A paper describes a structure:
The domain consists of a mixed α/β fold with a central six‐stranded β‐sheet surrounded by four α‐helices and nine loops. The active site is located in the shallow cavity of the upper end of an extensive recessed cleft defined by loops l1, l5, l8, and helix α2 across the β‐sheet. The Zn2+ ion in the catalytic site is coordinated by His17Nε2 (AmiP (B) 2.18 Å), His85Nδ1 (AmiP (B) 2.15 Å) and Glu32Oε2 (AmiP (B) 2.06 Å). One glycerol molecule (GOL) originating from the crystallization conditions serves as a bidentate ligand completing the Zn2+ ion distorted trigonal bipyramidal coordination geometry. Glu145 acting as catalytic residue located in strand β6 is oriented in proximity to the coordinated Zn2+ ion. Compared to these structures AmiP adopts a distinct compact organization achieved by omission of a helix α4′ and shortening of helix α3 as well as all β‐strands and loop l5. AmiP's compactness confirms a trait associated with adaptation to high temperatures as it was shown before that hyperthermophilic proteins are usually shorter than mesophilic homologues (Walden et al., 2004).
Here, the detailed functional and structural characterization of Thermus parvatiensis prophage peptidoglycan lytic amidase AmiP, a globular Amidase_3 type lytic enzyme adapted to high temperatures is presented. Endolysins can be divided into three groups (i) peptidases that cleave the amide bonds between amino acids; (ii) glycosidases capable of hydrolysing glycosidic linkage; and (iii) amidases cleaving the amide bond between N‐acetylmuramic acid and L‐alanine at the N‐terminal portion of the stem peptide in peptidoglycan mesh (Vermassen et al., 2019).
Author numbering: 7 to 175
The structure:
């Protein structure tokens, strides 16, 4: 397993992440969104790997270790927010280049997009902070049913800025 960019679908298996009132699991939206994004990054000429490709829980430290073993330079975690979230955004690690990558991705996520350091999260840290490279956690808006066409639109939006970051950094 070798890859320049690693996609990390948040949660999985026994960890559903956020659950919509209709039962949509963040974990399933995450995997679906990451699978679609991989197709866009491969089309732009990048070797893409995953921390998970199925509905199984991968320990947070193993997500980071797998990325390092694959020789990843960029770590992109894929999440959806609580079902009442209004605005997409990006958390960035304190590692050099993370904030730059987050801002270029946030610029593609439309009106009201935010960026925050991992230190602004509930416990003041995120697992992405262990990755020795640019590392972000994208919250693609609220946990709710998401169509194929919306997944493709989001993938196309963020693929270009990720690929342009990877080319320049
Ligand atoms: Na862990
Ligand atoms: Zn999440």
């Amino acid at each position: 397993p070798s890859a320049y960019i690693v996609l990390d679908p948040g949660h999985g298996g026994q960890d559903p992440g956020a659950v919509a009132p209709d039962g949509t699991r963040e974990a399933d939206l995450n995997l679906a969104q990451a699978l679609t994004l991989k197709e866009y990054l491969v089309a732009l000429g990048y070797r893409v790997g995953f921390t998970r490709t199925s509905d199984v829980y991968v320990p947070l430290s193993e997500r980071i270790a797998m990325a390092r073993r694959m020789g990843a330079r960029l770590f992109i975690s894929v999440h959806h927010d609580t079902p009442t979230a209004s605005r997409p955004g990006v958390y960035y690690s304190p590692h050099p280049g993370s904030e730059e990558l987050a801002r270029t991705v946030a610029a593609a996520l439309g009106e009201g997009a935010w960026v925050r350091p991992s230190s602004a999260s509930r416990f003041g840290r995120l697992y992405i902070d262990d990755f020795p490279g640019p590392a972000i956690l994208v919250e693609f808006g609220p946990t709710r049913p998401i169509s194929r066409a919306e997944r493709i639109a989001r993938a196309q939006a963020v693929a270009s800025p990720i690929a342009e970051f990877a080319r320049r950094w």
